[PDB]
Amino acid sequence: SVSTGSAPDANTIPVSKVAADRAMDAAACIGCGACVAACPNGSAMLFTAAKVTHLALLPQGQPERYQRVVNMVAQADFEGFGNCTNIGECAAVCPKEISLETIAQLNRDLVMAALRGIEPNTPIVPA
Amino acid sequence: MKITLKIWRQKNRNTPGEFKTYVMDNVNPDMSFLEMLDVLNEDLMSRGEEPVAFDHDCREGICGMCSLMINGVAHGPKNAITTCQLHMRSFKDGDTITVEPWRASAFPILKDLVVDRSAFDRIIQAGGYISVSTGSAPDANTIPVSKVAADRAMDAAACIGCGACVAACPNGSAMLFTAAKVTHLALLPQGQPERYQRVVNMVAQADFEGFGNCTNIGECAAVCPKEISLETIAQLNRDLVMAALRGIEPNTPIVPA
Amino acid sequence: VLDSKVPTGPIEQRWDKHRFEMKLVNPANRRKYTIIVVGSGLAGASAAATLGEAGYNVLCFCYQDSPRRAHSIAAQGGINAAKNYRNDGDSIYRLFYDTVKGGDFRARESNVYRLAQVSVNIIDQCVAQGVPFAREYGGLLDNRSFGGAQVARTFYARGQTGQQLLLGAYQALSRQIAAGTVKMFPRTEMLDLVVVDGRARGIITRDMVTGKITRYAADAVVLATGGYGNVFYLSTNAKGCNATAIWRAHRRGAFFGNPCFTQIHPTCIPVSGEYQSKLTLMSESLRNDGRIWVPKKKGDTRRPQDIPESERDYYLEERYPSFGNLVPRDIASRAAKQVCDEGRGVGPGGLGVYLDFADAIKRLGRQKIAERYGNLFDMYKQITGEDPYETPMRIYPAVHYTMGGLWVDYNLQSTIPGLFVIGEANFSDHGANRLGASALMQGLADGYFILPYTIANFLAQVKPGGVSIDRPEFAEAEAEINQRIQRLLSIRGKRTVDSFHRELGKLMWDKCGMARNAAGLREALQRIPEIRAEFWENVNVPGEANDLNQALEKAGRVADFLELAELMCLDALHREESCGGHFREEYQTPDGEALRNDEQFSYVAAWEFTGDLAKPRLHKEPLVFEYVKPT
Amino acid sequence: VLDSKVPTGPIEQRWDKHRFEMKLVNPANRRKYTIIVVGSGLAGASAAATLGEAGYNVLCFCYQDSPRRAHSIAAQGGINAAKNYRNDGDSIYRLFYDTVKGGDFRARESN
Amino acid sequence: NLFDMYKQITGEDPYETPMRIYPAVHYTMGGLWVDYNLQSTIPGLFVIGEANFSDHGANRLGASALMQGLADGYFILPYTIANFLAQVKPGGVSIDRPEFAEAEAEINQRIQRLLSIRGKRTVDSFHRELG
Numbered sequence A: 001s002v003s004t005g006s007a008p009d010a011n012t013i014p015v016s017k018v019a020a021d022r023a024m025d026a027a028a029c030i031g032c033g034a035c036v037a038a039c040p041n042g043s044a045m046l047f048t049a050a051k052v053t054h055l056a057l058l059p060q061g062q063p064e065r066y067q068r069v070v071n072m073v074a075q076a077d078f079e080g081f082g083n084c085t086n087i088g089e090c091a092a093v094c095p096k097e098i099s100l101e102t103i104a105q106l107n108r109d110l111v112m113a114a115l116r117g118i119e120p121n122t123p124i125v126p127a
Numbered sequence B: 001m002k003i004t005l006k007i008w009r010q011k012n013r014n015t016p017g018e019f020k021t022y023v024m025d026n027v028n029p030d031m032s033f034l035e036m037l038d039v040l041n042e043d044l045m046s047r048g049e050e051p052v053a054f055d056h057d058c059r060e061g062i063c064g065m066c067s068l069m070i071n072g073v074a075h076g077p078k079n080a081i082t083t084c085q086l087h088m089r090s091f092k093d094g095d096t097i098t099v100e101p102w103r104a105s106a107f108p109i110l111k112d113l114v115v116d117r118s119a120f121d122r123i124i125q126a127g128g129y130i131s132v133s134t135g136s137a138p139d140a141n142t143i144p145v146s147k148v149a150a151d152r153a154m155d156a157a158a159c160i161g162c163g164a165c166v167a168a169c170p171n172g173s174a175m176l177f178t179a180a181k182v183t184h185l186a187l188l189p190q191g192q193p194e195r196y197q198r199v200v201n202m203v204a205q206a207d208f209e210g211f212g213n214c215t216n217i218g219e220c221a222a223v224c225p226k227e228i229s230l231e232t233i234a235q236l237n238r239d240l241v242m243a244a245l246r247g248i249e250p251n252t253p254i255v256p257a
Numbered sequence C: 001v002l003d004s005k006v007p008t009g010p011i012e013q014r015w016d017k018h019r020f021e022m023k024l025v026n027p028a029n030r031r032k033y034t035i036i037v038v039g040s041g042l043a044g045a046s047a048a049a050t051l052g053e054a055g056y057n058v059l060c061f062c063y064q065d066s067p068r069r070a071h072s073i074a075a076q077g078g079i080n081a082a083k084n085y086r087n088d089g090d091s092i093y094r095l096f097y098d099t100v101k102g103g104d105f106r107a108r109e110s111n112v113y114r115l116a117q118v119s120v121n122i123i124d125q126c127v128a129q130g131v132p133f134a135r136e137y138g139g140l141l142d143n144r145s146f147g148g149a150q151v152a153r154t155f156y157a158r159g160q161t162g163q164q165l166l167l168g169a170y171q172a173l174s175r176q177i178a179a180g181t182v183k184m185f186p187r188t189e190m191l192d193l194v195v196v197d198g199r200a201r202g203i204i205t206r207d208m209v210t211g212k213i214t215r216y217a218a219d220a221v222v223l224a225t226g227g228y229g230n231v232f233y234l235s236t237n238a239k240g241c242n243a244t245a246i247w248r249a250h251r252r253g254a255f256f257g258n259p260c261f262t263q264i265h266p267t268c269i270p271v272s273g274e275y276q277s278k279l280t281l282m283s284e285s286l287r288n289d290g291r292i293w294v295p296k297k298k299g300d301t302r303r304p305q306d307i308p309e310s311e312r313d314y315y316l317e318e319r320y321p322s323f324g325n326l327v328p329r330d331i332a333s334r335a336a337k338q339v340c341d342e343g344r345g346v347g348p349g350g351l352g353v354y355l356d357f358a359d360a361i362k363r364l365g366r367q368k369i370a371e372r373y374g375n376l377f378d379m380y381k382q383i384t385g386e387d388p389y390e391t392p393m394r395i396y397p398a399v400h401y402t403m404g405g406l407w408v409d410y411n412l413q414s415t416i417p418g419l420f421v422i423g424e425a426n427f428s429d430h431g432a433n434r435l436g437a438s439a440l441m442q443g444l445a446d447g448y449f450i451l452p453y454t455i456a457n458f459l460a461q462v463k464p465g466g467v468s469i470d471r472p473e474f475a476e477a478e479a480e481i482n483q484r485i486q487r488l489l490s491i492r493g494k495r496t497v498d499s500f501h502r503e504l505g506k507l508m509w510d511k512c513g514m515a516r517n518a519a520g521l522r523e524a525l526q527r528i529p530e531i532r533a534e535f536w537e538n539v540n541v542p543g544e545a546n547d548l549n550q551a552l553e554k555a556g557r558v559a560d561f562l563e564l565a566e567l568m569c570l571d572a573l574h575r576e577e578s579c580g581g582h583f584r585e586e587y588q589t590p591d592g593e594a595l596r597n598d599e600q601f602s603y604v605a606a607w608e609f610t611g612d613l614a615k616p617r618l619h620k621e622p623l624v625f626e627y628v629k630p631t
Numbered sequence D: 001v002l003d004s005k006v007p008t009g010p011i012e013q014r015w016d017k018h019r020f021e022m023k024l025v026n027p028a029n030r031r032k033y034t035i036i037v038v039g040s041g042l043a044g045a046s047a048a049a050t051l052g053e054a055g056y057n058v059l060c061f062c063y064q065d066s067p068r069r070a071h072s073i074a075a076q077g078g079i080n081a082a083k084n085y086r087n088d089g090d091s092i093y094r095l096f097y098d099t100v101k102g103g104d105f106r107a108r109e110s111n
Numbered sequence E: 001n002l003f004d005m006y007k008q009i010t011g012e013d014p015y016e017t018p019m020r021i022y023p024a025v026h027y028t029m030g031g032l033w034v035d036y037n038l039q040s041t042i043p044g045l046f047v048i049g050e051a052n053f054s055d056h057g058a059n060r061l062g063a064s065a066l067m068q069g070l071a072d073g074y075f076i077l078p079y080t081i082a083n084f085l086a087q088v089k090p091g092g093v094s095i096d097r098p099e100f101a102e103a104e105a106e107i108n109q110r111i112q113r114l115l116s117i118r119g120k121r122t123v124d125s126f127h128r129e130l131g
């Protein structure tokens, strides 16, 4: 949640090369939806986990990550997707080879958010 | 609305005081308490007695100069308001109202209802700040501060320094004031580099100044005009425990001039 | 002759060129100079903290319990800066143009540009000190529009921006006090200024707790004692705000710059009887719904909500319909004062007009109205005792701010050499009208980024020390103060101090108030000396000098107000034009705005004390405009 | 006739002078205007997001399944800027000269 | 990622077999003419991105269309569109005006004609011939 014109200088916040590389690996998701079609539960956990991992590996995504994941997860439950049984078909089908560790990162973030009492906001109703 | 008042009357710091009664016949229900005191003072001056002295600057509950113990409860019976914000619509016809200053060793009484609250200033002087000099500040948007952290810092930072927490506390402790300042400075990144020293210094100063200890009674948060929560004291306790684990030694106390 | 000392060349490099051209004091020598700072507001505390950080010996004063009690603390609105964080078109030049046009072309351009140029540094410093500004969800600062400004350039705490700014300044001052550089003397008020060989070299103060009279000596004296809007008895200023310091300095030789320039506030809670003198400031964000009305019948006992729509005199609608009920605050408040003066008020004493919200509640949703006016409605219910959601609000205008004060040049130095006036006590750069969220910015700019350089230049031009507190000037000032206090205590008449203050305030509000005419000002100038003589002959201030005597302080402030009122009435009579806050009924356009006269009154008037309160001397400092043209 | 409406004076202050000279809409009045944006590429999405942040009512359109499926998602090369981080002689003027010379002198200088 | 991509598409390893290439049209510098305010000849119509002529002249430098589009979207169009909007009164035009009806009727007639031609050659045949 950054607005136009308020950004600081580009080199203000340093990001380690490893963190940037992992964020780029998670951020290269083309939103095809093949993960949903391969998961026997019809879950969008790989897509959500990839977005959460992308935004959670950079400092600019720190101020609202623990809320972010919760909201996103709730929205998936609201949209009709299933749950994740850690089966792993989505990782084998994903065109960009997004690893199953994005889901582990999402699980860690959600556990930490639950420990802090973060509650999901109102769901995004379609127009 | 006939009102009888029992006001504490003390000539100076060394002269002992006593309660005196004043009966007033007509009191407008919608005028504030301090304006009633002003009308009483005008009547006293007309009659020929010494007027009642009390602290008042803004009359909006922001400056923090109002300090009155009305009917046994700080800042009047209503909560989350200061003395300047209390109106006589909250009282009853024929009621008897007792008016007193704060009572503490660190708040000496100078007049009828005026006290010396420089102890809070000295507590602030011993680390309750961020040591940044003029001209060296970076750009405003350099360091991001989450909205929740900024909101909690603003909640703790809205302390008007009235000293009602000391007066309500059975031990006469300034734990709520110190905790509010520590919480304000500890919730922003700019306050990180010296927080673990800061709290220790501030706490020591309170002990040096003559305040009591905190028994977690919670009386302070019930009369605080700005509703500072008791979680500030928990934050101060966490900070002090973590500072003790680091071997942080308090500095020399701030001796008054 | 008044030398503004403004630089030359392009306006963007004027401040930098001046900064290069001024002299400096070596950091080793700074400890040899003593600076007295009278006042601990935003300007005073910022100046004291910065001068303590530099190394000078600073002696700060305030009449309250603590330095953190000052009507800098009460400010609710935000603070402006030319950061352009919202990408809406704001810039330093845009802010400079806005401030110089909002003042109705009655201020120097260089000062306004310097303020607009240092606003960005003001915001950076305030953020770095831990001030809790409102943030967005991403962690970056949030901006809002000041209820009509064309850009969103305002930084704010939730509702107490002034409190947070003053607390940052007070924390810096406390840090300097702990370092031993600044000595703070609360609960004492400066009563006189001592000038030695044409330089302001010290002050005479009275300690209000013990009554002690003390003499302080220093190389330079800074005055940051705030505005004098309390000369009218009813105002939104604090109960202790006064004009003692600036009036004593003016009597010593300082020049008073446009004393008649005052600014009022449209919406304030009306008084509840002839005993209250404080009117609580509301927010300007009201009046957006409009619905200002008054019952058609002069006296109605029916409830406000029981009055039918056809029976309501919805004035400000059948008059000035072209504006859309969003008439300028000057015209709306003049109409409200006239309506209340006709005897058609609605308050307890007949002072106040109805601000209805029922139609706004019906048209809009109560949820949004609550989410935008909840704090205001709760505050009104706490004080007034009536719920705005059901019954109409009551409002009445009151005097809020004073643009006038002591004349200062580009170096913030008054006519008396070595005397620096910052904050609201100088004429400075607001011109004839103060823009919203600009007094805080002006005070912080003067304290932080402007005064250090100019005071260093002045101190480098001279040598430290040489004046002690045993000079005959100190003795004469102290004797005059003692005689004045003894006379005050020995008058022991009948009327109280507040009666004289109320009479003076009502006379000043009726004649030299919002609407002024030559006949009214002449009558007021005739009346003022009689009130002053009656005060000096028939006042009753009881107690003893060597105690905590509040009536004595009030008596001194009232005497100074009685002297200042004559000068400001004379200044209002002099200026035969309408501009900004100063309004003359003979120089208005038919719509009701202010009709200027730029070919005869495009100057700053400085008034010199000639020893006579009826014949002060007038000096004109011409104004030349090169980048912004009057229109 | 075609009026380019380019500013005057030195080329470094042309955009700032134009920004000062142009009119403004108060933030309160922005909600009364509706803007249609046809396209959701880099330009379209950036414009829609910025005008939404300002406060206007924006109506964005695209013919694909989703706004992200637009073109310019396939751009493989980097993006230029005159930041001079590598400290090798780059600047705003150097970039302006490079862009106006690489275009074979067939474009306006102010843009 | 280029030899592998070429092998994935073509099916021949560049390390052992020569690559095959052929030029193709990539970008269009031309488009709708706009003035300094990014406004076309029609008042109120703003063209940004690749759809306008703007400032690439006769040849687009590498990594320039991305920053051109982002500049138009982020830092240029807001100011100019606000400048245009501040000079006009909001609202006043609804979707019941005759211009909307005429445009909608023209579109409907065009679509009906396209559907009713039902010739022999396909659309891609004509597109290929034109290309």
Ligand SMILES: Cc1cc2nc3c(=O)[nH]c(=O)nc-3n(C[C@H](O)[C@H](O)[C@H](O)COP(=O)(O)OP(=O)(O)OC[C@H]3O[C@@H](n4cnc5c(N)ncnc54)[C@H](O)[C@@H]3O)c2cc1C
Pocket: C038, C039, C040, C041, C042, C043, C044, C061, C062, C063, C064, C067, C069, C070, C071, C072, C073, C074, C075, C076, C077, C078, C162, C188, C189, C190, C191, C224, C225, C226, C227, C236, C237, C238, C241, C242, C244, C245, C281, C400, C401, C422, C423, C424, C425, C436, C437, C438, C439, C440, C441, C443
């Ligand atoms: C209710 C209210 C709301 C306002 N809201 C806004 C707003 O939203 N935005 C804005 O830009 N401006 C606002 N202002 C205006 C602005 O806040 C003040 O005008 C400004 O802060 C004054 O600057 P100052 O520090 O010099 O004055 P003050 O802060 O009033 O300075 C007074 C200081 O001088 C000392 N002093 C005074 N007289 C003496 C004496 N005789 N002897 C010794 N010490 C003395 C006092 O002890 C105190 O330390 C508001 C003003 C008021 C009253």
Ligand SMILES: Cc1cc2nc3c(=O)[nH]c(=O)nc-3n(C[C@H](O)[C@H](O)[C@H](O)COP(=O)(O)OP(=O)(O)OC[C@H]3O[C@@H](n4cnc5c(N)ncnc54)[C@H](O)[C@@H]3O)c2cc1C
Pocket: D038, D039, D040, D041, D042, D043, D044, D061, D062, D063, D064, D067, D070, D071, D072, D073, D074, D075, D076, D077, D078, E026, E027, E048, E049, E050, E051, E062, E063, E064, E065, E066, E067, E069
């Ligand atoms: C393969 C490739 C690589 C490139 N690499 C680079 C590079 O490295 N650097 C560089 O600077 N430039 C590069 N470009 C050029 C540049 O990225 C794009 O060509 C384009 O100029 C930038 O995107 P745009 O938003 O302007 O247009 P686009 O992203 O193409 O805009 C298309 C948008 O308009 C919408 N739209 C179109 N027609 C309609 C219609 N009739 N109705 C409704 N919506 C419609 C679409 O739905 C979509 O949202 C490359 C282009 C290509 C094709």
Ligand code: SF4
Pocket: A028, A029, A030, A031, A032, A033, A034, A035, A036, A046, A047, A050, A090, A093, A094, A095, A096, A098
């Ligand atoms: S399959 Fe992979 S690339 Fe496709 S939507 Fe799922 S996570 Fe994204």
Ligand code: SF4
Pocket: B158, B159, B160, B161, B162, B163, B164, B165, B166, B176, B177, B180, B220, B223, B224, B225, B226, B227, B228
């Ligand atoms: S913590 Fe509350 S009661 Fe104590 S001084 Fe601060 S505002 Fe007053």
Ligand code: F3S
Pocket: A035, A038, A039, A040, A041, A043, A044, A045, A046, A083, A084, A085, A086, A087, A088, A089, A090, A091, A103
């Ligand atoms: S395969 Fe399906 S069940 Fe979960 S772990 Fe992957 S989305």
Ligand code: F3S
Pocket: B168, B169, B170, B171, B172, B173, B174, B175, B176, B213, B214, B215, B216, B217, B218, B219, B220, B221, B233
């Ligand atoms: S009420 Fe008193 S006992 Fe301690 S926790 Fe608060 S100071």
Ligand code: FES
Pocket: B055, B056, B057, B058, B059, B060, B061, B062, B063, B064, B065, B066, B082, B083, B084, B085, B160
């Ligand atoms: S006078 Fe300021 S809080 Fe009461």
